[PDB]
Amino acid sequence: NPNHLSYFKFVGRIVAKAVYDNRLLECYFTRSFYKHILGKSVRYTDMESEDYHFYQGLVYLLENDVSTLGYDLTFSTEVQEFGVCEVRDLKVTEENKKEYVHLVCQMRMTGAIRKQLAAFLEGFYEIIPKR
């Protein structure tokens, strides 16, 4: 839909309108999306439901030595957004991976939805103050 961002801004407005009216919607958004509307980072355990084999990959990165991979990785990943696939930088080491799993989960959740998200957040904060 070429206007989809506008409809996501509409639904953010309608959610904030439901909150203003104090009326319950049958929305059941992910903890990731509720965190985005609250401005909280997601956590890697959220990936288990969204992309189990990518969660499993991050869990194989956690509590395992990088030497188990047998080839190197860096802070860059291939992401499909809007049907275009692009390799994007995220900013590997024993110190960096703690951030990689946080940041890689940020990229995987928001990258493909960042423009829908910015429209929804504009609709929400238009009616319900972020703070």
CB neighbours (10 Å) of residue 79? 15
Q: DSSP letter at 25?
A: -
Q: Give which of 7, 5, 33 is closest to 109, Cα–Cα.
A: 33
Q: Are strands 76-81 and 84-89 parallel, antiparallel or unpaired?
A: antiparallel
Q: DSSP letter at 42?
A: P
Q: In terms of DSSP H, where are the helices of 39-130?
A: 47-50, 52-61, 97-110, 114-127
Dist CA 55 CA 46 (whole Å): 8
Q: What is the amino acid identity at position 29?
A: F
Could you give the angle at the alpha carbon of 24 between the alpha carbons of 121 and 111, nearest 5°? 25
Question: What approach was used to elucidate this structure?
Answer: cryo-EM
Q: Give which of 16, 14, 6, 22 is closest to 37, Cα–Cα.
A: 16
Structure's resolution in angstroms? 3.3
| Cβ neighbours for 73, distance < 8 A, ≥ 6 positions apart | 92
